[PDB]
Structure 1
């Protein structure tokens, strides 16, 4: 059921925002500040930005038909991080820790 699975998606996102994962999830909470120092080329490289607060808003506005569409936006958020940053960047390691949480929950739902 699409309704039941979207409720599960809201539960996954709630865990990603939880204190348990806060040490590595915090860079993903809000949209990337493209006006910040070092991010002058972000919009040239990242054509479709995504963050957890935007996904929470899309869930609330019924913008996902099913769990696969919610999953696509979570993976877009991580892929943007892996595309923009150098592979040894601190934020890439944080993205992998949070993607581990997401993938385990998304697979078992």
Structure 2
């Protein structure tokens, strides 16, 4: 099965929009973590492969996911990075958990249809 790039984008986009719709929970995820601006030099020692919503959106818009599971892997990468780096009761961690709840609800039927 070979996916047409614009069809894959159309099918997956609503799941990404669902994440952006979460306010305030998407706010820490709408742009990359910048350890230099934040002064957290330990971040890239723990998070080897950073990911965020803006990067996923760009990849989804520019034919970078040839198969749906590649998009799903990047969403989970974003979540797992945040859940590894941050305290469980931190705002980021709690917001991450809400996005993951929304994502699983939205993605499951889409992947079955694809």
TM-score (norm 1): 0.88
Structure 2: tracts of 5 or more residues without a match:
none
Per-residue Cα deviation, 1:63-99 (whole angstroms, up to 9, x for no partner): 1012111000000000000111122222111100011
Partner of 2:14: 11
Partner of 2:41: 40
Structure 1: tracts of 5 or more residues without a match:
none
Q: Which runs of 4+ in 1 moved over 3 A?
A: 1-6
User: How far apart, CA to CA, are the structure 2 residues paired with 1:37 and 1:58?
Assistant: 25
TM-score (norm 2): 0.85
Partner of 2:78: 77
